[PDB]
Write a protein that binds this ligand. Sequence first.
Ligand SMILES: *[C@@H]1O[C@H](CO)[C@@H](O[C@@H]2O[C@H](CO)[C@@H](O)[C@H](O)[C@H]2NC(C)=O)[C@H](O)[C@H]1NC(C)=O
Ligand SMILES: [Ca+2]
Ligand SMILES: [Ca+2]
Length: 275
Amino acid sequence: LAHSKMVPIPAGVFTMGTDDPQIKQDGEAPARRVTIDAFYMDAYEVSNTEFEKFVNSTGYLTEAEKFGDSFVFEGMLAAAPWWLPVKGANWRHPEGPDSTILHRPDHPVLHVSWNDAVAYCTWAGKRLPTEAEWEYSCRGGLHNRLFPWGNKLQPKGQHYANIWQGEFPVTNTGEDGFQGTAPVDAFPPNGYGLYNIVGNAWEWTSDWWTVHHSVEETLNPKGPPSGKDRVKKGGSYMCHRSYCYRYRCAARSQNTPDSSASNLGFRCAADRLPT
Ligand SMILES: *[C@@H]1O[C@H](CO)[C@@H](O[C@@H]2O[C@H](CO)[C@@H](O)[C@H](O)[C@H]2NC(C)=O)[C@H](O)[C@H]1NC(C)=O
Ligand SMILES: [Ca+2]
Ligand SMILES: [Ca+2]
């Protein structure tokens, strides 16, 4: 269990975005050439256990605990009728008060806000990645592919990510081996050595959200200087093509920095290795 290990992501130039946006409302277009300096990125989503080390040390009280509620998928018991705001739903109690994390220590932490994530990473001698670092990393050395691994969803007939199978929201067949979340080290790594960069839990980035992008070539871009929503990436175990096709590197979405929910977590990046 090296669930806080990092990988060196190589310096390089890449196509961020796409001239074939499958969800236009989200600012997937235009494709634009971005240059990214070499850095490090968590190989894994931050796990319940890793977060607990953080909380052991600092006594950090997450925002869901402070507000007293968080968003849980009805399916496992508001932005959709299936998102319910549940009292005493937080990272220790992912589906509300009578749920627990004891049987799932290696699964990614949930019900953490952008602030929670930042407190963790900075605690950890790290920081959140920018969207561009995230997306570049997601792509995993490949150019203009849908997914970290290519354009087939199940290559060689194999599940490569934790998402929805079946009729959403009513039936999740769990064909891919998991109905909710999966251990942070489940499924194959992309070419850069990252696990579950699409699927499992959504992932916070450091950028404010905008849908307005130039084709101006940029270098280590931080997104806009302001916003009201922060950028999240890579879909979750609830994604399906039929209604939410965001288990692609190009896809993107947003939340206010103080939101939290049962399919949303994070991982850290860093310019240089921490201790
Ligand atoms: C966070 O702190 C708690 C409490 O100090 C740790 O749990 C204890 O660990 C010791 C040593 O393994 C055991 O003898 C006890 O059985 C535990 N006590 C309790 C209160 O359950 C816990 O391991 C820490 N969590 C993490 C992720 O490091
Ligand atoms: Ca699944
Ligand atoms: Ca993920």
